[PDB]
C-alpha cells in the first residue's frame with residue numbers, strides 16, 4: 402500500500418517491454434513453429450514415395 | 451471486534467489510499 | 479532422527495549413428511544402384527537418429 406504507485410508503474414513498463422519484444426522479430430515462438438515444420442516434412446516424404 | 455491483538459501498526463495514515471477513521475479497542 | 483536417503487534417476491542415453499549404405503551394401507556399386515529404387519530411406523533413418 403505504501404508503494405502502490407511504484408508497483409503499478411513497474412507492471413505497466415513490464416507489459417510494454419513484452420509488447421515490444423514480441424514485435425521486434427522474435428524467435429521465442431519457435432516451439433510452436435516446429436509443430437508446423439515437423440508435420441509438413443512428414444507429408445512431403447509420403448508424397449515423394 | 452477490532453483490537454490491538456489482531457491488528458498491527460505501521461507508518462502514518464497518509465500514504466495509504468482508501469484509509470478511514472474508526473476507533474480501536476485496547477484490551478488493557 | 480535425521481535420515482539421508484538416495485534417489486537414482488536416468489537423464490540421457492548413448493548417442494549413435496548408422497551409415498545406411500555401408501550397413502546395407504558396403505563398397506559395392508552394383509548394390510548401390512539397386513538401393514536407389516527403394517527411394518529415400520537412408521535420409522529418413524539418418525534424420526531420425528540425428
Ligand SMILES: *[C@@H]1O[C@H](CO)[C@@H](O)[C@H](O)[C@H]1NC(C)=O
Pocket residue numbers: 467468469
Ligand atoms: C472508488 O472508485 C470511485 C469511482 O471511481 C471513487 O469515486 C472512489 O473515490 C474510489 N474509492 C477508493 C477508496 O479508492
Ligand SMILES: *[C@@H]1O[C@H](CO)[C@@H](O)[C@H](O)[C@H]1NC(C)=O
Pocket residue numbers: 469470471
Ligand atoms: C479523520 O480525522 C481527521 C482528523 O482531523 C480528519 O482530518 C479526516 O478528514 C478524517 N477522515 C475522514 C474520512 O473523515
